[PDB]
Amino acid sequence: GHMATLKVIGVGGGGNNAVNRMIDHGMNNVEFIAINTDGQALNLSKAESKIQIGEKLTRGLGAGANPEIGKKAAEESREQIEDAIQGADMVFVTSGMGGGTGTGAAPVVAKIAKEMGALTVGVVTRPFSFEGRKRQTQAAAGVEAMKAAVDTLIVIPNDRLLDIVDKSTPMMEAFKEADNVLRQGVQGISDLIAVSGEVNLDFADVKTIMSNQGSALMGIGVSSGENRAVEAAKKAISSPLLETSIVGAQGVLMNITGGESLSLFEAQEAADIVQDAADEDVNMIFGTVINPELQDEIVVTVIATGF
Numbered sequence: 001g002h003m004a005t006l007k008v009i010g011v012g013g014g015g016n017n018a019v020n021r022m023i024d025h026g027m028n029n030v031e032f033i034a035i036n037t038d039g040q041a042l043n044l045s046k047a048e049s050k051i052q053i054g055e056k057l058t059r060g061l062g063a064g065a066n067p068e069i070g071k072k073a074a075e076e077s078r079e080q081i082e083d084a085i086q087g088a089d090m091v092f093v094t095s096g097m098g099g100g101t102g103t104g105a106a107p108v109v110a111k112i113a114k115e116m117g118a119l120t121v122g123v124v125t126r127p128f129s130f131e132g133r134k135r136q137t138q139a140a141a142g143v144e145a146m147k148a149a150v151d152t153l154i155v156i157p158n159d160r161l162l163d164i165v166d167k168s169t170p171m172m173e174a175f176k177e178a179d180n181v182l183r184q185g186v187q188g189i190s191d192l193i194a195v196s197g198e199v200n201l202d203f204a205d206v207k208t209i210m211s212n213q214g215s216a217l218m219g220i221g222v223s224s225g226e227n228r229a230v231e232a233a234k235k236a237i238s239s240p241l242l243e244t245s246i247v248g249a250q251g252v253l254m255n256i257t258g259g260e261s262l263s264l265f266e267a268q269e270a271a272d273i274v275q276d277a278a279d280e281d282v283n284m285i286f287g288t289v290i291n292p293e294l295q296d297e298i299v300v301t302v303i304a305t306g307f
């Protein structure tokens with residue numbers, strides 16, 4: 001009876017916004033931690049655990065867009081960060097790259113989590129092009145530092161949100177689409193840990209696919225009716241919001257959930273959709289859950305890594 005301990009850690013403004021909106025949803029058995037220099041924003045966090053970093057350095061303000069201040073702030077507070085991560089088996093570090101606190105502190109937070117043996121996944125945004133080339137260059141250095149500090153990294157270029165809005169779509173509605181990348185990845189692992197599958201996968205399979213593996217994709221597809229299996233598999237690997245596509249994937253963890261009508265043939269169809277993109281020598285871990293509460297709906301979930 002192994003019950004993996006998951007923690008989601010927001011770092012900086014954007015990261016903690018995403019955590020707050022996640023908490024507004026129904027997320028149980030995940031621990032949320034909020035880390036910021038900005039005391040004003042931190043006080044409005046909904047997370048159980050709040051860590052104000054760098055208070056001596058910033059006097060309670062943010063980092064003023066200076067990543068070196070974010071980095072020093074996280075180092076000043078290393079012990080408080082260690083204490084908050086204690087017990088974690090898996091840590092999601094979420095942050096908006098390009099500012100001061102996220103860019104600088106998020107790699108330190110991820111390094112501490114990995115030092116403590118936790119499976120460490122980064123979920124970060126790149127700035128909009130309209131924020132300017134300098135912010136983009138600063139964010140790019142953050143991404144590289146995250147790569148060197150995490151097991152696996154998911155990068156969401158904010159420019160991709162401009163591909164899914166019309167001219168009137170509210171900004172907050174667009175942000176919720178980016179939030180969903182994190183929410184569905186965390187919820188997917190939670191489901192995998194809690195549910196016993198007819199072909200059962202568990203946290204050790206997640207570790208094999210995600211430990212020290214670079215870029216990652218975490219997707220989910222839901223469909224019904226004819227060709228449901230193919231359509232759900234296509235949805236799970238085709239997010240318009242990710243920087244890393246599934247082409248060339250060297251590891252894949254894949255699960256299909258459906259009712260008692262789930263057929264062997266459609267399991268093959270869904271797996272073939274994913275294989276046709278991945279490397280021919282991909283390490284594929286395939287699972288299946290039969291949820292008789294379901295009727296015609298089928299859910300395909302995919303973790304892809306190794307490029």
Ligand SMILES: Nc1nc2c(ncn2[C@@H]2O[C@H](COP(=O)(O)OP(=O)(O)O)[C@@H](O)[C@H]2O)c(=O)[nH]1
Pocket residue numbers: 011012013014015017018062063064065095096097098099100101102103125126127128131135158175178
């Ligand atoms: N998608 C999304 N991006 C955000 C959000 N908040 C900030 N960003 C992006 O994150 C970058 C860093 O901003 P922020 O996190 O506030 O800076 P920091 O607190 O100094 O780390 C910005 O340049 C934006 O590109 C948010 O709520 N959603």
Ligand SMILES: NC(=O)c1c(F)ccc(OCc2cccc(Cl)c2)c1F
Pocket residue numbers: 184185186187188189191192193194195196197198199200201202218219220253254255287288289301302303
């Ligand atoms: N076969 C299982 O034990 C199982 C289960 F009983 C529930 C969920 C599972 O996978 C969820 C998942 C997979 C890939 C990506 C993501 Cl995000 C989520 C499973 F593999």
Ligand SMILES: [K+]
Pocket residue numbers: 191192193194195196197200201202
């Ligand atoms: K399971």
